[PDB]
């Protein structure tokens, strides 16, 4: 084995909430904490010394580079050369005093879209030398807090600080649609597994679903605190939402029941589903990276970092997790099965 499982336990932290107010501690099925495609643990394998708080992180496909968004720039790190201590590239994106908030790779790996605390989204050509700026999208919203790319690669969705969701046609750099609804900043975003619906979370305490074909708001979920992060299960049915209250809420899509998960002491700043959908991670201001079984939230592993964990990503094969830190670095983990 090399590392072996060892069971721990906690006061009940995972609850099923039925249509009424009723809250029952989840009795875990036999494959809650162990099974095919379920991690046994995670091993830190690199530290990427950005030197500014890492508010955004993404990993290439194939996994060989990591992109860290800090203050004004994205740094590019070659993790397939374990001895490297500095970036191989740096992408100067915003004013040196403005934070990057999101960075997304197009499905084919040739292009990076970057947004943050500024009106412009920068589009980067990653085909060699020399990553270069290919285009800019200029919004009239003061900031971008989150990005999502359509599965066909044609459109970029930007969560604006005024609560609007901008829809950008990437080919001609035109804002083709705007989803209006959120009455404070839109903080996070994902697309449904069938690609037909958008899901967004807000600093107005709502989660909203939107029809991508018609453009109209479909559902609204009102919470008692602000939403910072969200993720749609890639095999369907479940939406996980990270709350300022410290909860993760796992909403049963279209249905009145949910799971409430309590393993953070502060705001849940980021979350991400594994590509297989069977598990996800959440990160907190309390320094924890939590791994959770889908949907009911059995705790698969926890890693306590040195500082707030602001952002995360998981590689396309579910083999690596990258986290961005308030200690001005990113961490690369290998997921051990």
């Amino acid at each position: 084995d090399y590392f072996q499982g060892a069971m721990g336990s906690k006061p009940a932290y995972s609850f099923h909430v039925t249509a009424d107010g009723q809250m029952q501690p989840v009795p875990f099925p036999p494959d809650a904490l162990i099974g095919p495609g379920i991690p046994r643990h995670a091993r830190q394998i690199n530290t990427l010394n950005h030197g500014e708080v890492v508010c955004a992180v993404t990993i290439s496909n194939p996994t060989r580079h990591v992109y860290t968004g800090g203050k004004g720039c994205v740094k590019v790190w070659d993790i397939s050369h374990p001895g490297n201590k500095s970036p191989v590239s740096q992408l100067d994106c915003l004013n040196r005093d403005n934070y990057i908030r999101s960075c997304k790779l197009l499905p084919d790996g040739c292009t990076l879209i970057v947004g943050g605390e500024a009106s412009t989204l920068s589009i980067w050509d990653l085909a060699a030398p020399t990553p270069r700026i290919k285009a800019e999208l200029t919004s009239s919203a003061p900031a971008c807090y989150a990005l999502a790319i359509s599965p066909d690669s044609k459109v970029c969705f930007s969560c604006c600080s005024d609560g609007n969701i901008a829809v950008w046609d990437l080919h001609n750099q035109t804002l083709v649609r705007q989803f209006q609804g959120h009455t404070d900043g839109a903080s996070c975003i994902d697309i449904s597994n069938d690609g037909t619906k958008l899901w967004t979370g807000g600093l107005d305490n709502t989660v909203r679903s939107w029809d991508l074909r018609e453009g109209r708001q479909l559902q609204q979920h009102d919470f008692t605190s602000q939403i910072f992060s969200l993720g749609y299960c890639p095999t369907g049915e479940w939406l996980a939402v990270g709350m300022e209250s410290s909860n993760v809420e796992v909403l049963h899509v279209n249905k009145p029941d949910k799971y409430q998960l309590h393993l953070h002491e502060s705001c849940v700043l980021s979350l991400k589903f594994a590509y297989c959908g069977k598990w996800f991670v959440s990160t907190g201001k309390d320094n924890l990276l939590n791994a959770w079984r889908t949907p009911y939230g059995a705790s698969i592993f926890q890693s306590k970092e040195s500082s707030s964990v602001l952002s995360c990503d998981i590689s396309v094969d579910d083999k690596y997790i990258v986290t961005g830190s308030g200690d001005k670095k990113a961490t690369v983990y290998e997921v051990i099965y």
Partner: peptide
């Protein structure tokens, strides 16, 4: 509305 400085400090 939240800037990163608000979130951190």
């Amino acid at each position: 509305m939240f800037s990163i400085d608000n979130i951190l400090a």
